[PDB]
Design a protein around this ligand. Structure first.
Ligand code: ADP
Ligand code: MG
Ligand code: MG
Lengths: 754, 788
DNA sequence: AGCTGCCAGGCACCAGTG
DNA sequence: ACTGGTGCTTGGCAGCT
């Protein structure tokens, strides 16, 4: 097998699937890492059935592996960040290619969604921001330069691709980007003066082009994301708020699981982007809010229609790549068929933004008519075997098919003719590749076949024959079909030519449809779930009347207790005592979720919310070392525009050390940072803080002891807690009574020394 | 819905539905000629689970029957798929002869493949036990039994309480758990794999006794020491009935049952087992466990046995001394024994297939190879002047006659299956050889006919061949075919060739296949006969496998003791643990840098240590290594230290710190004794400042003053360092830290007394907390420190 | 060596003479 | 009632390129 080895060197950095019979087999080291990744056997060979290759490619690509397919020669390659095939993508998840690099002055970063064409670049100000952007974008494939210093940022990520330094040269990048966009300069994209970011994007685009060996006309724009444009959230915060991912790695019981009832896969993906990137510009937010409210009574009629539009976004990508398959065009046609009904439904909505989306939507009556005439109602997966072009679309095509059916109908008549004559009831005409057409007779009647029948194939219970008259029409059939097939294929390629001119307008439509899906959805959720429109004030503050945790309230089959919150420049930090038992943490997390939601443009779970600008949200909620590292992050980065949620810091070390640290953090947060803060603590001593500094107050939760248990109330009230419940809980758990009695005596002694 | 009364169904479905009625909840593979088929819901389910095509069988009565199936020769690959997903599958075979059957041939379920009853090499993992268990509860308590179908090891027990029961489940980790329908503590059981709810009557004591006595050939179970344990017998009865129901043959390798009494092993609670990382790390992997360090056995059966020992430390002083002695005596011989031991392989699992009568040709082959190693082992072992070793040598036996049999009866490298012959070697049976003669004449006869006929006809394309569908033939090209002898009878037409038969060739065919049939049948008789000659020796063979596995374990522990520098612990009469220069056996191997050895002094006068030191100071490691040294001493193995004296230990408890914390703690307080090793790691959590600490203080006090167990009590609460003053039996120790400016160095060495200070602030400075904050914390700290 | 499609052996089904 | 043809799963491989 010197053939495999000599071709493997052409692709040493990538897994190589080597076709052998009805399998692709991997050898040596590739056989290893693969068995470990797909959990297939190990014989050193490993293999997968031909009919399942796409399934296994999806898994490998999902785990960051590029794969080269040898059919001999490497005829196809898939990389985790550049796929567009529906079989390899996850319907409701974004799949991004990214590139990261470090200059002396700072970071450059860029991402690309190869299906939608969404191309973004940024220039994170420091390591912490960079880490938060990596987590937020979660790239499937990440290009980085050799000369990369901070390798801790990308070390454990899947899909790492180490690239030479010359791939990050600013002049090349500019030239390449300007050529891709068809512009002289980048001023119109607002990135002309963002060199570091441009370098990242240049390497990215070159890598994408290379993986496709194709033009990428759907990539026509790039956008710059700035720090002040969005509320910043770090990995731990993002993870702790359970936005699209729960703490156990799942997808259930998350903010998205409740907010995301969109009806198309592109709308679902767009909504998840918004949730992970709340905007600060209240201009955008106000528009989103207006829209939500104006779509309330339109929601029922809109969604079932929107649902049929489907994932026009990813189909458009295969159109741009010329890989679209018959059902892609079929689904595109179906989506076009919904446009007029959507147009009619939105006509009355009094909302300027809705009217904009409506126009942006388009109609494409011509394309619709074209696809209606060209393609049959329900085409096959592939064009390969023809049968996609409808009848009446092309005369030549209708003719060859008429000829094929005529020969076909003749052979069938031949079967009945030969049948009266011979008088053999088992006589039939069949078709096979090896022998073409033939006449079959059962073994038992075969001795009666006419003398002009030529034996060609003996079966266990039959004899197949041929005659010139059979071979005559076979020719008619085959040559006619061959031409029909060839013509369908040409007509099919011609469809791309007629569609591609309108690629730009179609991308805008899918984008508008996706946004309508998101907004129609948030409209439905607000109305259905009793949300309210938050208002914005100029200075930092959060006033919530009867707020609820938007996830907990839908899951728990027990009445959710709503709670107020009044935070302002004069009431900046609340010290929260009492049992936590999930109650404090819930109250804190819901505060962050409501802020989150306010800043995505959505309605929120409350009777009333007034909220000020927020630059970042900090949530150290839920090792003493990790807890201290996360605390350091907050004290170092938070500002007076930050929302900080602290959950009992001090646990995990000595009483005096933890109390000293918590007192110090709280004081710093209240007097230096001045961030809006919810400080949950178990230290009763911290409740004296409000008597020592302005802007701090005590609230608490309590519990109710009754019968043979304890009810941990979820109601936040003013003042310090006046009870602890550790001993009550220990008593309920069965700690012997005399132990509890001693504990009680010790507790009093410890507390009274205060 | 069509009304589907018996009479509305075809004879086929009537038979199928009656059999399926006997297996309503599991897939029924139904033998239909060359296929195993499934129907209705089984077919749809199979389609999804096996990824095969869901199709249908036509019906003259309306509703087409959902259908799916696989070729009989491929069944094993599909069973693997199913049993790996925890699916049971009943195997129905055709029992009678269609050729003398009016309607449907007799069919019967001959075996049910289930997750805890597999014995086939392809479905099992080499180094992991695969147990079937049965659990049963009462008002009083629990009954539990386990069976390893592929070794015959049959055990029973009666865990006193829930926490014990949970620890038992975790330790035995059954792959299939049979439970009684009236089971109350479902929390112990839901979430387990291969759960099997059983009707109450399968746990009836009278039937259990009757069935076990029958299986064992006894009148009572007095001799097994379980006549006394009806709670356990009920589970054992449910189990055995399951095992017999799944195998539907005799189980001669299940000749005994043993009771596991609490007093006979160190009982480790579930948390101890998880925290010690015996065979599974806290993340679920096998990397960096005690097992990954200690397990360098050379056979699979030895790997399994060693893991069983690690999980069940023995309290019997005598067994322990004998294991130590063996390890001592064999430490020189390891390099010589291991390569030889390795060639014995997994005799245990092969013996199970022998007993089940499922053993494949290469199983008998590997048995042979194992027998062949006995003499060398026996030789290597004669010199070792240690009784326990000599006792093992004897038990491994010789089986010279069986070695000869296998050497005479089967070829060097037999094929995987017996089904296509080629297994029994020549000279074993003279008739068999005679039948093969005609089967090995094919060499010359057919080549001779080809030449002869090619020459006679002058047709150069002429060839003689065989076709399974059409038989033997003479082939002439299409071009020369019109020139064939008029005497040649046409048999098979091809595109460019014509095949013919003649009387001489047909006569050859007739006999060359009648003979081939006789040769295969005779072979299978002789193969099944091998079982009858081997079976009578099963018990001694099982004793031998058991001895070889124990040897592998002891030889490995001796190698490890030498290689990793371990010493032989001694036992003392009263509870106590004295360690000189001890190390954590895993941490020291998985660390690229020196491990700091430490001592330990525990006694009835010094029975509780309050352990302080900075977070990351090595507090948790010190406790763990203690428990591990204890565990290792109590399996008979040498220990990671310079010297170790250790007293009796009944149980090891661990609490590694809400309702859970205090519930577990409560169980510790309720069940620990002066003989228990208690490890409390940072417990005591309340909703206020002193809430939690107060409970930890009262708990510590109870452990010291009422229970009096051996207790390691690691804490971050500095208040607790005051306990020794107040309480007899308590002493402070600490993991030393050195502060040199902005930083803190962890020395990882245990010192007597309390640390001079706690290091929360420095540890927090280390984590990056801003200096102005730390400075403010230090100021607050001095305020607090002035209260007293 | 790569595609197609017969065959395997159960049993029912169905159109065609009994 | 009989004859004699069809159908249906997947793995193996003949029979042709
Ligand atoms: N005695 C030892 N010798 C060398 N390293 C040690 C030793 N004990 C602990 N360590 C290292 O220090 C780390 C922290 O130990 P740990 O027992 O978890 O400390 P603690 O319980 O005080 O927080 C361990 O992961 C180990 O890597
Ligand atoms: Mg029959
Ligand atoms: Mg610890």
């Amino acid at each position: 097998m010197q053939q495999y080895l000599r071709l493997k060197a052409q692709h040493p950095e990538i897994l190589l699937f080597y076709r052998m019979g009805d399998f692709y087999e991997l050898f040596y080291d590739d056989a290893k890492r693969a068995s470990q990744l797909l959990d297939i056997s190990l014989t050193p060979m490993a293999g997968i059935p031909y009919h399942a290759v796409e399934n296994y490619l999806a898994k490998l690509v999902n785990q960051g592996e590029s794969v080269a397919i040898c059919e001999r020669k490497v005829v196809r390659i898939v990389t985790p960040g550049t796929i567009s095939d529906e079989a390899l993508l996850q319907e409701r998840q974004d799949n991004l290619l990214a590139a990261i690099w470090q200059d002396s002055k700072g970071f450059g970063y860029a991402t690309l969604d190869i299906s939608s064409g969404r191309f973004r670049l940024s220039e994170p100000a420091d390591r912490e921001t960079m880490a938060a952007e990596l987590q937020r974008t979660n790239p499937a494939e990440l290009l980085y330069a050799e000369d990369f210093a901070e390798m801790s940022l990308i070390e454990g990520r899947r899909g790492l691709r180490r690239r030479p330094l010359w791939e990050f040269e600013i002049d090349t990048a500019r030239q390449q980007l300007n050529l891709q966009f068809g512009t002289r300069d980048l001023v119109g994209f607002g990135v002309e003066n963002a060199p570091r970011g441009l370098c990242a994007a240049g390497c990215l685009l070159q890598y994408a082009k290379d993986t496709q060996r194709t033009t990428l006309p759907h990539i026509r724009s790039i956008t710059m994301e700035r720090e002040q444009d969005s509320i910043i959230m770090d990995a731990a915060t993002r993870r702790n708020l359970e936005i699209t991912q729960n703490l156990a790695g799942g997808a259930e019981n998350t903010l998205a699981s409740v907010l995301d009832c969109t009806v198309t896969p592109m709308g679902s993906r767009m909504l998840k982007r918004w949730l992970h990137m709340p905007v600060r510009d209240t201009r955008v937010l106000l528009e989103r809010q207006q829209t939500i409210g104006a779509l309330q009574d339109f929601t029922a009629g809109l969604q079932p229609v929107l649902r049929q539009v489907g994932d026009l976004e990813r189909i458009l990508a295969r159109l741009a790549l010329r890989t679209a398959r018959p059902r892609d065009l079929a689904r595109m046609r179906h989506a076009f068929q919904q446009l007029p009904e959507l147009r009619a439904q939105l006509e009355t909505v009094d909302s300027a933004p809705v009217q904009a989306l409506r126009e942006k939507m388009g109609e494409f009556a011509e394309l619709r008519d074209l696809l209606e005439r060209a393609i049959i109602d329900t085409p096959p997966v592939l064009v390969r075997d023809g049968g996609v072009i409808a009848s009446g679309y092309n005369e030549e095509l209708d003719e060859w098919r008429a000829l094929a059916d005529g020969a076909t109908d003749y052979l069938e008549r031949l079967e009945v003719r030969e049948r009266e004559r011979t008088g053999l009831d088992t006589l039939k005409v069949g078709f096979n590749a090896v022998h073409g057409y033939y006449i079959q007779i059962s073994r038992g009647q075969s001795h009666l076949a006419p003398i002009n029948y030529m034996r060609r194939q003996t079966l266990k219970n039959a004899e197949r024959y041929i005659i010139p008259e059979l071979k005559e029409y076979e020719d008619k059939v085959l040559t006619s079909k061959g031409k029909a097939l060839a013509l369908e294929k040409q007509l099919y390629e011609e469809l791309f030519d007629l569609l591609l001119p309108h690629l730009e307008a179609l991308q805008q439509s899918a984008s508008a449809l996706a946004e309508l899906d998101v907004l129609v959805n948030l409209a439905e959720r607000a109305y259905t779930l009793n949300y309210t429109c938050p208002t914005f004030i100029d200075k930092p503050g959060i006033r919530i009347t009867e707020g609820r945790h938007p996830v907990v309230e839908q899951v728990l089959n027990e009445p959710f207790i709503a709670n107020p919150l009044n935070l302002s420049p004069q009431r900046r930090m609340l010290i929260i005592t009492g049992p936590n038992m999930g109650g404090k943490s819930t109250y804190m997390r819901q505060t962050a979720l409501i802020a989150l939601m306010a800043y995505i443009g959505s309605y929120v779970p409350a009777q009333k919310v007034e909220i000020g600008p927020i630059d970042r949200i900090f949530t150290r909620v839920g090792t003493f070392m990790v807890e201290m590292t996360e605390t350091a992050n907050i004290l170092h980065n938070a500002t007076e525009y930050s929302l900080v949620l602290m959950d009992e810091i001090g646990r995990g070390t000595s009483t005096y050390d933890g109390l000293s640290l918590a007192w110090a953090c709280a004081e710093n947060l209240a007097n230096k940072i001045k961030a809006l803060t919810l400080f949950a603590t178990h230290y009763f001593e911290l409740t004296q803080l409000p008597e020592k500094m302005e802007g701090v107050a005590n609230v608490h939760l309590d519990a109710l002891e009754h019968g043979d248990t304890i009810a941990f109330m979820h109601s936040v009230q003013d003042g310090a807690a006046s009870k602890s419940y550790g001993l009550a809980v220990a008593a309920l758990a069965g700690v012997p009574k005399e132990v509890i009695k001693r504990a009680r005596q010790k507790l009093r002694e410890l507390e009274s020394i205060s």
